[model samples]
Target: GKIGIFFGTDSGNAEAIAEKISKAIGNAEVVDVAKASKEQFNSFTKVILVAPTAGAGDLQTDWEDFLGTLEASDFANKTIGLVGLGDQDTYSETFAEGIFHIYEKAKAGKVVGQTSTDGYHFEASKAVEGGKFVGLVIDEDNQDDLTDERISKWVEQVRGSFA
Candidate 1:
């Protein structure tokens, strides 16, 4: 009957974004993917996944092995959103690249929150689908000031679908 925010983090950046997203939604629960399971994941009709792409497009530690769990879960009745973090300038070749793995594994579910590729400059990104991101992509390293407005707009865009 509700939406949830799930995240895996290192240095807590992703976790911070998850909290921001949850608060913007006004009724979503924030969860840590480090302790998530299929049952917990399926408990919510809609969920937003927040994770960072580490060096060279690597998945956050908590999300590395969790891919198997995500792949095995059933998403026939679930809606999944994604929030990917990375430094575009530092990792232009693999900016927010980790989300692509999540996107591939969670394709069985109805994923929402795809955003336009405007206002961003990246050499490459695997998270792009049809020239748009598979979901929200944040670059705290270079664009920290834009985080709030981005979350607000994204929340507004997805709230109805999430509800």
Candidate 2:
């Protein structure tokens, strides 16, 4: 059986990433952020948020409604993953602020892995050092590759506990 997957993408780049991930995972669905709602959140067993960081290191406008619903719910036992899109040089301080905000709100949810920007190349940061939520760097520079292996590895880790 395949677990449910949802994404809130802005600027279409997140959508592209979601599409690649779904292909790799073999049982995920990528819905438009505008169409996502509280009901959808309740229905899904697992949630993977891939939102782009906007100017000033904020979540894009598309996630406004979704974030509101998530804040009002308790996903304590659910599984969650975050993939933030931002520019390191421009918004280094707030590098993935959007993902962190969601992680903070869903305090109870379990975070499986993380990615980071080291030397302009995107790689998974030390998962052992961080608590639960993991940060990954996805900028125009490194967007050419899907990094399917890493994505699959994290998905397996996240799904293992659920099984």
Candidate 3:
């Protein structure tokens, strides 16, 4: 699969998680959300996005701006995969809401990679709809032990959709 990881991070957690996913999903390169180009996106058919919640419960400033870019760009024919980082123990009420924002900007292609709401103990999440997470949810602060297993399972789920 033509793959690249586009991420917005504040303290490198999102970037770190993307690195693990790149290894699990396949060889993936990283792209900054603010610095990323449409040409870079077009170069890869599969765009795996990673972001973390910030402030009260929203995307980092960079990712918020990146969403605008996605809204203006032609994202057609690109398969989108999402991975979100959060601190469920600290922000259970808004665990990984950033993923949902990115999802709203999806213009085309199949946005796959839905994970169950089983292991998570969050109160509410914008990333969860229809009883499924918009994508992989990793709680590094609370459940760091499960990160690798979760990523592998998520990778297996979405790897087929990559092309």
Candidate 4:
């Protein structure tokens, strides 16, 4: 009722995480960004975007296309949450940084859910701002075990803000 979740993925990791988020945070609709419509997107004032970086810090294919559509839409009254998947070890320089591109498009609106960079180890990240990540970041490739706990806690954090 308060939030909507949209995601794009290549290896299904982002989609799987979206499902987990939908299950953990009930009442939030999870839509594939490829199939999502602006009408539906505009329906929710609060939204979570679950996306992954692919091939040198690029946004997943579906998100690449869908983002143009979203960039053209108006979100002056929206609040956005972000969930980004990356391999901290391999792409340390650009880890989970695709979300920053989305952040640029959505900055006209309020963006929430910035998380501490406490447990993550990375060389550099565009997602970092003021000593925190712009969103809840996941490194399932190396830290699969921590995902559930991370999602659970992030859900609580965003829920309070979304409320």
> Which number leads on lDDT?
4
Better of 2 and 3 by TM-score: 3
Score residue 43 of candidate 4 by CA lDDT.
91
Pairs clashing within candidate 4: none
Query: What's the ranking of the predictions by TM-score, best on top?
Result: 1, 4, 3, 2
Candidate 4 per-residue lDDT, tens place, 1-163, comes to 6678899988999999999988887778889998977778899988889999977787998988888787624566788888999999988899999888888778778888899999899999888988899999999999999999999999888777777
TM-score of each: 0.94, 0.75, 0.91, 0.94
Candidate 4 C-alpha error for residue 119, in Å: 1.5
Q: Which stretches of candidate 3 lie over 4 Å from their true place?
A: none
Clashes, model 1: 0
The 10-residue segment of model 1 with minimum total lDDT is: 67-76
lDDT of 1 by residue, 24-136 (tens): 88778888888888778788888788989976687898887666676635665678899998888887788898888888877787898999889999888898889899999
Better of 2 and 4 by lDDT: 4
Total colliding residue pairs, candidate 2? 4
Question: Is candidate 1 or 3 superior in lDDT?
Answer: 1
Per-model tally of clashing residue pairs? 0, 4, 0, 0
Q: What's the C-alpha lDDT at position 146 in model 2? A: 45
Report model 4's TM-score to 2 decimal places: 0.94
Q: Clashes in model 2: which pairs? A: 114-134, 114-135, 115-135, 115-136
